[PDB]
Every structure is written in structure tokens, then in C-alpha cells.
Design a protein around this nucleic acid. Structure first.
Lengths: 54, 119, 7
RNA sequence: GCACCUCGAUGUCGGCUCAUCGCAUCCUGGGGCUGUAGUCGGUCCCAAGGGUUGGGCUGUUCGCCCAUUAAAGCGGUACGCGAGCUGGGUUCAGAACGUCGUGAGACAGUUCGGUCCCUAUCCGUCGCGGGCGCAGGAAAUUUGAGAGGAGCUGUCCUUAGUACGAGAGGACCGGGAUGGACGCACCGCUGGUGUACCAGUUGUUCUGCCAAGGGCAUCGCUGGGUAGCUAUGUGCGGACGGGAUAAGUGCUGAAAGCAUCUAAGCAUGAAGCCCCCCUCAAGAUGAGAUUUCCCAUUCCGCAAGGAAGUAAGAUCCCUGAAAGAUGAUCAGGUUGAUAGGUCUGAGGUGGAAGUGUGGCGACACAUGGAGCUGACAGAUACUAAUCGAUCGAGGACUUAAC
RNA sequence: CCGUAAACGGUCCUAAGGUAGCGAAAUUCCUUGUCGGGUAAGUUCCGACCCGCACGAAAGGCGCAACGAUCUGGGCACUGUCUCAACGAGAGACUCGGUGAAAUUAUAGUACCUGUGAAGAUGCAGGUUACCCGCGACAGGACGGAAAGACCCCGUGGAGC
RNA sequence: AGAGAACUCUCGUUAAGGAACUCGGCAAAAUGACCCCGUAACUUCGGGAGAAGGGGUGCUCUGUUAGGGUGCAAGCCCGAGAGAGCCGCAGUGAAUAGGCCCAGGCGACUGUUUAGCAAAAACACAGGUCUCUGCGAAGCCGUAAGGCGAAGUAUAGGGGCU
RNA sequence: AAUGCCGGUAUGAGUAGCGAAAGAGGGGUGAGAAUCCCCUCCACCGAAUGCCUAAGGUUUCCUGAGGAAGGCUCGUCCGCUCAGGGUUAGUCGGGACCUAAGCCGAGGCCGAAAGGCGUAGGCGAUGGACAACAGGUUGAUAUUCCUGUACCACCUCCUCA
RNA sequence: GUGAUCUACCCAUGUCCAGGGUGAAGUUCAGGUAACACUGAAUGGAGGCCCGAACCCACGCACGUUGAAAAGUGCGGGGAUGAGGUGUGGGUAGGGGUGAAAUGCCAAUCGAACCUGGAGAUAGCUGGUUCUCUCCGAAAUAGCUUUAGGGCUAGCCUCAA
RNA sequence: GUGACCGAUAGUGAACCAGUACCGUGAGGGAAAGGUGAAAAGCACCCCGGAAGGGGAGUGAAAGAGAUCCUGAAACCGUG
RNA sequence: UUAAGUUAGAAAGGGCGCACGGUGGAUGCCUUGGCACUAGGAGCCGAUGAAGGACGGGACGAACACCGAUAUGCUUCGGGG
């Protein structure tokens, strides 16, 4: 449970290839925008298909 | 299979009763999404219990509704509110008395929040 | 002896 | 035996778990010689494919004994395996017995008791993903270079009480059932579990009180139990067979006019081998094959090539499980049953509340197979799967016919 | 030591050679001594034989009711200790949001087999395999890490008795 | 926050067997509450002994029971032990309150000890025995003064062994 | 190149951990709320997880602002920061009362020196004596502040026997 | 020189031990002696007594072992009116104290506590010892040695005359 | 008054609120930490931001000189 | 269009070089303080209360220095403007 050798810079950067995170499913809000993530109520106008329900 | 929601079964029952009654008075509450999904079936089952209107269904509902005041300056309990307003409002509708609308994640823990309302 | 009793 | 490696540490016995390898083979398979009448045997060959046990004693390996078995085989892998496990014995600090020593103390002599740390960096292994390649982009179906899994056997009946044998005894070969161990699946039964199912019941508190219920007391306790997961439950497998073979048995035959299993040519022959049984398999860079869609835009770069939109198709996002740590897979996204709700059922529990009757009452009876019911079915868009967005090709050059 | 059936006789030696009571023992190398009980099977246990290496009479001997967080055997009840494991609940582990270390570390693009070598190789030789980068697990190796081995030896080192 | 993977820990059940496990019933399970009957070997006659082994507990009435406590009385508390019954698989219905028996070793016993590895057979213990000491005692702490012993006086102090 | 010293920065790694045990919702403030305030349910302790009172800490207590760092996350909040404020006694505890163990100790007895011991005397509570209770009051003090009734010790410019 | 604010023992003065049982000595009434003895009931409530809470302790297992903790937690366990626990104030100090005796304890320290000096103790032992080029170039042998991994002299090397 | 004495890991432990902070019951042990500019002339004013912190505009010889503030290396972290 | 060959480009990310930055206080200057001394002086202060401290004193918030209820001081004699 003890590291025998230190990790080099290149192996660390190769391990950090998949550490990035993705862009969310964000779309144009039909009321005002911009923008609104899919299948959630818009935080700006408080509308959802298409009534102001807050 | 139902969710456990990170609680003991007694804590699960107490939290579900609290959320059911609080939805029944305030008519719109904001919880997490999985709590909403676990809550909506119980809430529509209790509305279905309120549909019957007899004494046995009311005594079944009294074992689940907590004793909090529903309507101020009227001394109406929540158990009276199910059998006076909600049952008469949803007499024609057959199921689907609640809807869940998702919000963004919470600041403190990244919890996806949801709006629950009686429709 | 070789007793493994390291503390 | 030596002291080559380790004393700025290579944990040492015996057990548990997991195994793997070599036959100098314990059984099973095929044979030769027997002072092998048959069964059972003895010795020597070929053969590692598979299997080679449950206890009593002792820390014990070993060993003895009990009961089986087809047999309970020898060894290597740091006397395999303690960053996988236990410390009973060795092997600390305490205290005794016997012996030695004036003594402090000592004893491969005995006994009682005695702290076993580590969050895995890399290679290894077991699973699951994301890229790019496979000279266009896709959706399916696949061949198999290779690899892994499996490979064990008992008992009974016929042949036949036949061959053989004075008798007792008693077959080889060939068929048919039934088992043990192991393995793969799945529960329809038998059971287990089933913390959002049903009922009974104790103490206290609460819903103002009776009644009826809620909270806590291990799910308070007790008696059952749907789905799922399960074995101790059920079904199935190691079947029938081909090719070249080992030890053996040979045929025809000369070197060597004979003889001869061999030097040429042909056979037969084992649970060994390579297949037939099952599974993964074109990153098999040697990137394979068949079927069916989409088409050959625009703008720069005079050539190579590079950007934008798109078709076929796929993804982001959402409903979920026959899947699952997360990804992934699968069923689906409003010309629809994907999940929840509602209704009707299956199954479970066992006769709800209220009312009435009988009783002084605890209680019983009728309404009434009642009431309740978590994941199990079938209907039903009532609710949520909205609007949307992103990725995704214009197909290099030679050679023979077109 | 030698005879004779503990006990008596002959001899050496000393101050004199173990009395009673126990005895294969917290004491017995041989040894799992022999016999019997307990069990189907008992290197442990119990009761006797003496064959006491190397019991023994206030470093007390032999018994002993009650007592013991003591040790060693055997029974009833009881059970997941296993035959032989299967479910269920909670916490961690898994995912996401916030915060965020440590031991260790010559550099490292860090396969396998057989040999070779300071005699046990990820890096050497010959061969066999292997597209790139991650995530969840196991721990065979890196003679893994942690402590200038505690054992053994040496020092004309030390300390306690 | 949410999924309810492996594995680790704390728990709860489990068919048919049961200690076949293991160094060793370690751990776990089981009994354990109140009342009644009964209780062996042995013994220092105190014990062992809650030995072992068996039976019954819930609720209603007869029932402000019989009998006691209190008070001037009415009235409020403690209330056995029984007869009619009523329910459930289950009645100290939950939670806390012994697992027993036989035969041996050692130590009598209660107690004390290696704070942080060993709680024991070790130490201690009343009793037993030996030895020293006549008081300004012996033996101790101090160069001494001073003091403990002891404001005690051989039935008293100190030391050794058991 | 000393298992060197000091300072800085990596690896492990976005990894282990975030330290027993119930939270849920609706309003409010605010740039920002799962963590701050209010309300309603629900839950836990209850021979305590309740009340106070020593030792100890010493400002940590109250109010108004603030959020840098410290809250193992966040923070509009805090035992954090800055400004101000708060502790009232003849009767409570101690001292102008007493003494035990022990300590100091004029003169004094010893001792190279330094000092050690010890009368008279004193110190020394954990003990003995001793006089105030019931209500209210602030955001912070209560047998101390206030309104009632009291009690203890001491003294007379006074009045009585 | 500094320490008994942890702990070992002692001194003085306080305080704590919910409940439920067993039941002694003694006394009374009977059976009973001339007067004692012995037995059965009543009273009595002794015990380094029993079961069991607070309190103290550490026997078994498990977890933790870069822990919530430099010794704990959970489930059981032992003592629990006494050789008891505990508070306050004191005393014994390191060739010393204290010790129901373990080589235990004396501030996470003990076969001789800690701090400061002698002191930069000593170490025939291990590690380390910092720029370059050129010329030459060893030995691992003998003797002696409390000597065997050290030293001295010869042997072998280098420079100059 | 002088150094073929030191220059901030050096020189007194201490060039700086140093025998200080801190550690230990105590005796005792004992740090780290200098530099804007010649002159604060220490960035008036505008914009983003709750603030911190930036971008302009000014002072300045220099603002990359802006409060651990002269010069600013390497390990380390990043973007093309 | 088929069949057989031969090549380029591919980058999730990475390596090397270059450019531009951040962290940090090495280096270089630099003393406000030290280390050795030299030539002289001084080598004691205290019951007429010492050395060393505690607590205080400023309009103003804490500390250093200074001072002491006459308290960030008070007299006399000189220097200096």
C-alpha cells in the first residue's frame, strides 16, 4: 500500500485524460433564455411548456 | 422496488408522512427529485383514500396524516381537508393527482431539486 | 529467534 | 558439508483458503510374462485425462485406530501461499516442578498466561468503459486464426450360474437401469429470507375522552408471507462416435536363397493427442465475409488538402429494468403502455371499522372468504417521458477486364 | 557394586546414606510404559502397578468442606462453530456536489518463459506475446513500506546483578 | 445528496444435522422474574443450596374478597389464597435481572500485583516455628544533633522461613 | 550523495477522511441559504444529554455591525473580528475567629562551608464558631439592586429602673 | 540543580455506597438439671456474608492499530459495609524514595527520572569528505602483537640527490 | 578610534517590540521574521464586482514599483 | 464497377523544442546590527531602602521607551536660539 516510485508528469497527465467533465444538456428556452438545461424549469423566467409556474 | 432514501425504515415512514401532510396543507413543496418520486405514489394513494369518503377510509387516513392545522381561523385539520376539498376537486380525475417538475442542482450539496404540486 | 514483534 | 546472497530485517512450524506443475501411477483405460484352470492376484511396459475421504488422539507433519471407498499416490512451487487468515508449538518480559550451580541464574526437560501494522504507485490477475484504426458514412447477421471450459466413476439385472473348475467357487466381451462426487441453469414444487405485506399481544406516551389508531421499546415481541435472491429443491451434462497414434498384436517380405513386426509397403490398438459437446472470439494492424440504406452539396486552397450545413444513422436530456458500482446493455419517449397513479384480477394474511344480538363482564356471533395489501399480471395517457440541441460522407494511387 | 528372597549378608566411602506418607506427578528421557474405565476410534483424562533418569517431610509431606474472571477431562440442554452456506437491516466502500491529507519516491515509454549473473531479473541474452487511455476489485512480485535485526558473532564498548 | 455491486464492520432470521468446527464449545445460542413442592455425594456441621429436578403466572366476575394501614366516621392505600369462566401459537406475551452436572491439579478463603502484553499456581493473609532485644532496648533514617520504634515495655517490638 | 540541517515545491490524488446518535416543510433576511432567524410537526436524554457549585479557564457573558482567516463543507451564523456595555453583600464563601496533619521558627543543639534539626510563638481547612428570608426587576447582577418584615457585633449628643 | 498537580505508600480532615435476601452470638417462653448442658418456637440483626444498581477494576471476544483515543469503544464480566472507593491539604527525591514484591512506580521516561555543565567525553566502528589535466603506479605477503576486520617494521609504489 | 572581520541560512540566540512567540508542572529549551520610491507624491475620478480583486485614467524616471514593496533563479504549476 | 497490392492522414490525450506567465526567495547590491581589538577612563551599588519587577501615568485605541499619585514628569546652574 506504499508507492514504490513516484508518478511522472506524463503518466499523471495520461491518467487525468478522463477527469474532465462534460457540457450539460443546455437548450434554448422558448420564453426568454439564455439558456435552459433540458427537462428542468428555467431559472430566469420560471416557465415550463409554457405556463409561468415558477 | 421502492427507494430507501438513506434512512431507516421508521425514519422513512416518518419522513414520508411529514412530506405527505406538508404537501396536503401547503399544496406545493420543493424537495429532491427522488423524494418527490417516492412521495407522489403515497400522496395519490391517500387522495384515493379520501375519494371514498366513508368512516373506514378516514380512519385509514388518520393513521398516516399527522395532526397539523390546515386552514387558519377555521380550525380545519389536514384530515378534514382531504375529505372536504381535495376529494371534491379530484372527483372526475382518475389518478395522476400530482406532477413533478425538476429544478437545477442545489448549491450546498449538488442535490437536484424538484417542484411537487397537486394537479 | 527471528520473532516478528515490531512495534 | 561449505559459507556464495541477504543482519541501514529475506517473518520462521502446523492448520484454513486458493491452486498449479512432474511422473518414479493409488484407481480408472490399453498390454507382455506368469509356477495366469475362473474370480482375486504378482512383476514389467504405454499412459497426468479426471478423481484421489469423514472422524478419535496429539500444536503437531508423521504415526496408530474406527468406518468407508475405485483409490484414500508420491514429491516441487521461499519444506507454494501471514502487504490472504489463525498463533496451538517454538520464540520476549511473570510464576512454578525436576536437575545443575555457594550464588546471580541455566536447561531442543515439563506446565500455566502472554499487543500478528499498512488507505495498492507499477507489473501481474478478475470484470467494465471511453478513443482511434480497419481507405466513404451506417444498421444488422456472421465465418473462424486462436483461446478457455468439460473430461471422474460405483452398484444391480441379463448374457449365465454359461465358459472354466473334482467340488467350493465363478467369467472376459456386449446390452439395460439406478446412484455418489462435480459442474451449468432455474424455481413450477419442497423449504429459507423477505425492515413500505397481514394478524395477535405487553409497557408507556400522544390524537380532549370511550371506541379506533399513531410513536418508542432489536423490525418491541410473536405467527405467517408477494416479488426478488436462493439450496438443502428441480432439470440437464460428461452420450454415440471419426483421424493419426504409444506400449503391444500383426500381414507380405529381403539384407542374410532360411527365419524375421521393418530396413520399403499395409494394418489393428488407450480414460493420452486433434476433432465432434459448451463458451469467448477479425485490435486475427493478416483488422475477414454477407444483406440493406445514404448519396455524391457549399466555400477556400490552382495539386495534396482544410472549414460550414446535412442524408442514412447515432447521441445529449428524460421514463425505467429482463440490466447495473459508475459507464455500458435492453424496453421506451405523446400516430404511446416506459414508469407511477386508477380499475379489475393473482397471491398473501385471516373475518376490518361501524351497527345489532347474547352475557354483570372479559368476549362470541351476523352483516362478510370480510377488510387490508411492497416490488405479480391485464386494461387505462390521468401524471411524467416538453420544446429542443449535438455528432455524423463527398469516398488516394497502380495493375487485368470493363 | 555382588548375592539372597521391602528385608538381610560381604566390601569401598562418608557425617549418615531417604523414615512416614505419596508416586509415569505443574516432577518420568525411554514413553503414546502395562492393565482397566470412558468413546466406534482417546499421544489428553481418570484408578491402580514401581520400572522414582531426577518425590519427600517447614526452600514442608499427605489429605481436605467451602471458595476461584485459574488449569485439565467428561455429560445434558443449546445453537450458522461447519456439513454448507443463503437472505434481510444499518455504516463505510460506488456516483455526484463542497473541502481535502499521509506513509513512500534515483530517473522511468515499468509483459511472459527458459537461462545467465553477487548463485532467486520489469530493465541482461534467446524466444513467445502485446493498439492508446481509464474505472471498480484481488494481493503473486517489485527480495514492498514502516524500525542503521532484537536472534548469532565482534568491540581489549557499556549497564544491572 | 442517491444507488442499494463485491468486500469490511454492527446486527436479525434460517430447512435437516448437530460440536461432525477448533489447540480448546473461542464466539454465538440457551436458561435467567415471582410463588409452591423437592433437593444428593461430602463436610470443619456453618455450608454445598437459587444443588439438581418439576408445576403455575394473562383478563372479567364472586371482588370497595378474607385480613391489615390510616381516620371521629364516610372515605383513600397494602392486599394474599381460591371457584365460575373468557381469549390467543405464546400470558414476568415487550426491556432489564444465573446455564447446569460429574471427576481431577494448584492455591484454603476475602484481597493484591507487571498504569500501556502476563490477574495467575505469583504476592499477601490469621495461625505455626526459629532468632534478637531489660529501655538512652534491638533494628532503622541521618557525619551529628534529632527521630521512628513508642508517649510501647518480653502476652512487647524487629528480622528469617512456612 | 552524511536515514545531513533549513526553506520551498511535487508523487500518492482530486485519493483516504470530514470524528457515535432524525430530521422534514412553510415563511423571513440576504448578492449568495440543506447549514442563519421564526413557525408547525416529528425525534432524543430525562439518577440526565435536567437545575447549581466548586477546582479550573478568565471576558469565552450582553447588545450593534462584520465575515478575511478559524468553523474538517457552506455561512447572511458562532465560544471568530471590531466597537460599546455588564459582576453592587454586616447576614453568601474566606480574611480583621480557632485549630489538625504539615511547615516556618528568636534564644538553642549539631555540622568543612552552604546548612540540618528543634522550644517559646506563629502560619496552615479538607474540620469547629458565627447574624436574611419571601417576592419582583434588566439585554446582560440577585438569600448583593427594590418592597416588606428581621437578625448579629459595637458606641451614646438621648429617655427610663 | 528541578520534579509525588501522573503514580507508589503514609498522615490529617471530609464525603459516597439504590434496593432485596441468608441469617450468627446473645435474650425470652417451653421440654429440662439441685445448679450447667441439649432441642423446638419468638426476639435480635453480627458477617474481610449472598444477589444486584451508582462507584471502582480490567477477565473473554470483536473493532480500531497514518484510530473518535500515544491504551479506547461495544457486548458480556469481577468486587460492590469494607484489606472499600474518592475529594482537599500535606510528607518521603534518584549510589534516593516507595513497593500485599512485578525490576513495578516516581509527570506518555525507569535494571536506575529530567535539566544544565565537565563536553566538541571516547569510539581500533559505520557513513561522508566539494575544481581540472598530465607523469608514474601498488598490495591483499612475512614476523610480532589480550592479536585475528587494529597497529608497527620488512616486501611492493612515488619524488629528489 | 581600527580591521586583507560578517553581510540577513552570515554576524550576538536576537540588525525586525528577543530571551519574544511557542514547548515543559518545574529546572530549562528556544525560534522564524531586513529592503516601494529621492520625495506617499500610497493610484483623485470612471466601469465590473456584495466585498476582495481587476481594466482604464493620473502621480512617478520606472505601477511588470502598488504595501513580505529592489533584482528576481531552480524545483513545481499552467496556456499557446 | 470488380479483384489484388502500395501509401498518406488521423490525437482522447502525450513527448521534445520555443514563446508567454504564476509560485519562491536563491543570487547580486544593501545596512539599521554584530565579532575581535587598540588608547584612555571606570571597576561597585545598598536599611538615607539596592539589583530586578508588578501596577499605573498621554485628550485619544494596545505595545516599546520614559516617568511615579508632584506619575510621557518638577526645580536650580550652564549650552543653544
Amino acid at each position: 500500500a506504499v508507492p514504490f516510485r513516484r508518478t511522472s508528469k506524463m503518466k499523471k497527465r495520461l491518467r487525468r485524460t478522463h477527469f474532465k467533465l462534460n457540457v450539460p444538456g443546455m437548450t434554448e428556452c422558448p420564453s426568454c433564455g439564455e439558456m435552459k438545461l433540458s427537462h428542468r424549469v428555467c431559472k430566469a423566467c420560471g416557465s415550463y411548456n409554457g405556463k409561468d409556474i415558477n | 422496488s421502492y427507494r430507501k432514501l438513506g434512512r431507516t425504515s421508521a425514519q422513512r415512514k416518518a419522513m414520508l408522512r411529514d412530506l405527505t401532510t406538508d404537501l396536503i396543507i401547503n399544496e406545493r413543496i420543493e424537495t429532491t427529485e427522488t423524494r418527490a418520486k417516492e412521495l407522489r405514489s403515497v400522496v395519490e394513494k391517500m387522495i384515493t383514500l379520501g375519494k371514498r369518503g366513508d368512516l373506514h377510509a378516514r380512519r385509514q387516513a388518520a393513521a398516516y396524516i399527522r395532526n397539523e392545522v390546515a386552514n387558519e381561523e377555521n380550525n380545519q385539520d389536514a384530515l378534514q381537508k382531504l375529505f372536504s376539498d381535495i376529494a371534491t376537486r379530484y372527483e372526475e380525475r382518475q389518478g395522476g393527482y400530482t406532477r413533478i417538475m425538476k429544478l437545477g442542482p442545489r448549491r450546498g450539496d449538488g442535490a437536484p431539486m424538484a417542484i411537487i404540486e397537486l394537479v | 529467534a527471528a520473532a516478528a514483534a515490531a512495534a
